[PDB]
Amino acid sequence: AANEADYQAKLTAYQTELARVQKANADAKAAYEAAVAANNAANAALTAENTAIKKRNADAKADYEAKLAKYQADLAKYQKDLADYPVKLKAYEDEQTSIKAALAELEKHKNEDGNLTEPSAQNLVYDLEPNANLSLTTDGKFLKASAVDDAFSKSTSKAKYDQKILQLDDLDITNLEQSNDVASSMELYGNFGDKAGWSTTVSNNSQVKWGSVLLERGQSATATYTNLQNSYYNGKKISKIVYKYTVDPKSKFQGQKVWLGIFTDPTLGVFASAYTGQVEKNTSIFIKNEFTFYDEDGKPINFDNALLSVASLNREHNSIEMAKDYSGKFVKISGSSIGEKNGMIYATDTLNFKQGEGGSRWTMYKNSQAGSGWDSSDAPNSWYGAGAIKMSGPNNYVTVGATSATNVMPVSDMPVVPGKDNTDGKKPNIWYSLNGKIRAVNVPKVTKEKPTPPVKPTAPTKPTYETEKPLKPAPVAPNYEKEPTPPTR
Numbered sequence: 001a002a003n004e005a006d007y008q009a010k011l012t013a014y015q016t017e018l019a020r021v022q023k024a025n026a027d028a029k030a031a032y033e034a035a036v037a038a039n040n041a042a043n044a045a046l047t048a049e050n051t052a053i054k055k056r057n058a059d060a061k062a063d064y065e066a067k068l069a070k071y072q073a074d075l076a077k078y079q080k081d082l083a084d085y086p087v088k089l090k091a092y093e094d095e096q097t098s099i100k101a102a103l104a105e106l107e108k109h110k111n112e113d114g115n116l117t118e119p120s121a122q123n124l125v126y127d128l129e130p131n132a133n134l135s136l137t138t139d140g141k142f143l144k145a146s147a148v149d150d151a152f153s154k155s156t157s158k159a160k161y162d163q164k165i166l167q168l169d170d171l172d173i174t175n176l177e178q179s180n181d182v183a184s185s186m187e188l189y190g191n192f193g194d195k196a197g198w199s200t201t202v203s204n205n206s207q208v209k210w211g212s213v214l215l216e217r218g219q220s221a222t223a224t225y226t227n228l229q230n231s232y233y234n235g236k237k238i239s240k241i242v243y244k245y246t247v248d249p250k251s252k253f254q255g256q257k258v259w260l261g262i263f264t265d266p267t268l269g270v271f272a273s274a275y276t277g278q279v280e281k282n283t284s285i286f287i288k289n290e291f292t293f294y295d296e297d298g299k300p301i302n303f304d305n306a307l308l309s310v311a312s313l314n315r316e317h318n319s320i321e322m323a324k325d326y327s328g329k330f331v332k333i334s335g336s337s338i339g340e341k342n343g344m345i346y347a348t349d350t351l352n353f354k355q356g357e358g359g360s361r362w363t364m365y366k367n368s369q370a371g372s373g374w375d376s377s378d379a380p381n382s383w384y385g386a387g388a389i390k391m392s393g394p395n396n397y398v399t400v401g402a403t404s405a406t407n408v409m410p411v412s413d414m415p416v417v418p419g420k421d422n423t424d425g426k427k428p429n430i431w432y433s434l435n436g437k438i439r440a441v442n443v444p445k446v447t448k449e450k451p452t453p454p455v456k457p458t459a460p461t462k463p464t465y466e467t468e469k470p471l472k473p474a475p476v477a478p479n480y481e482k483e484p485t486p487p488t489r
């Protein structure tokens with residue numbers, strides 16, 4: 001009995017110890033699972049972040065190399081410009097000396113025929129741009145080239161047309177006013193393509209092209225000329241010119257429509273016409289011109305006394321071509337028929353059509369007389385019908401047109417040409433251009449631009465790389481307690 005009681009005591013003790021170890025190991029296992037979960041979470045995040053780090057580093061490296069490529073090009077350009085600076089500076093300084101010496105000599109001839117009364121160098125080189133590109137917008141109507149061709153082949157310009165000549169001042173615009181003459185985009189017309197070899201009143205047999213529009217008073221057309229090759233301001237290349245042509249509401253032509261032919265070469269200007277077949281008394285046609293020149297960077301050029309040539313200002317016994325409402329200051333050419341009066345630039349005191357008529361010194365067209373044919377691009381004395389306007393600022397303007405003499409002054413104050421009636425009607429049309437081809441003699445031109453120290457580029461910022469992190473080692477498994485041994489009876 002004592003042994004049995006002793007045995008049961010040990011059995012109970014044993015079973016209690018067993019249960020203790022079991023619970024203890026259960027808690028241990030739970031703690032190990034918690035450590036395992038924490039370790040797995042840690043390595044999951046480390047693995048994911050490492051993948052992310054590899055990607056960020058790759059992108060960083062790629063962006064950096066992309067930047068070095070642009071920088072390398074910029075730096076090479078910088079070092080080149082830096083090396084060329086002295087050469088450009090000498091060229092500039094050397095031309096500046098020459099021009100100043102040239103102006104000094106001119107000062108002594110400023111009152112001789114053909115000389116600008118105010119000696120000045122032409123900082124604006126803008127004389128010929130045959131390869132310029134013309135883009136037009138308008139609040140009027142674009143005219144189809146086929147319609148322009150048809151108009152030239154009919155009415156008053158037909159005779160010349162049939163002789164392979166495009167006579168712009170004879171074009172009857174009546175045939176450009178039909179609704180079916182309107183185009184959706186600008187179309188070029190001229191003595192090219194199927195009409196290569198033809199002549200026109202603009203540049204004889206040289207090829208010219210123009211876009212056409214039909215405008216009413218107050219309406220305009222804006223021309224954007226690009227692809228310029230030979231124009232500069234103070235040696236700085238001119239890359240673009242934006243020019244707006246507006247029909248002056250004050251124009252007195254009888255019609256309500258105007259045809260504008262805008263040449264692709266900006267230096268050739270424009271032809272404006274309200275002519276419908278018959279001459280008109282007390283008539284006029286004026287076109288407002290607003291323009292801005294731009295540099296290679298597309299920035300507006302702020303002129304500092306740029307010389308604008310105003311030439312071919314014809315004055316017949318019944319007609320006066322003039323420039324007015326202009327920005328800038330008029331500069332007279334000594335000996336020229338052109339002067340300024342009441343805000344208008346024109347032949348103020350004499351006519352300039354035929355020698356001996358109304359005080360004209362020379363005949364505008366070529367004939368048997370010395371000096372005849374002054375009204376031509378290459379005439380030695382074209383200055384006889386020209387002047388200049390010194391302009392400053394990026395936005396300039398001037399209105400150019402033709403008007404009956406009777407609109408400008410009383411009949412009693414006009415020159416008398418025996419056999420000619422000063423009240424004769426005229427055609428309400430005109431061709432004119434505004435460029436830098438100063439007609440005065442021996443005018444020095446600026447061709448060397450003053451150089452500016454190049455801007456040194458900035459090397460790209462070194463890439464910021466991150467280090468990947470090592471995974472954490474798995475937690476060590478706990479050492480569970482061993483079970484107690486069963487007692488024996």
Ligand SMILES: O=S([O-])[O-]
Nearest residue numbers: 192193196207209
């Ligand atoms: O000028 S090309 O278009 O004949």
Ligand SMILES: O=S([O-])[O-]
Nearest residue numbers: 354363366367368
């Ligand atoms: O100008 S006419 O006399 O040749």
Ligand SMILES: [Ca+2]
Nearest residue numbers: 312313314321
């Ligand atoms: Ca003219």
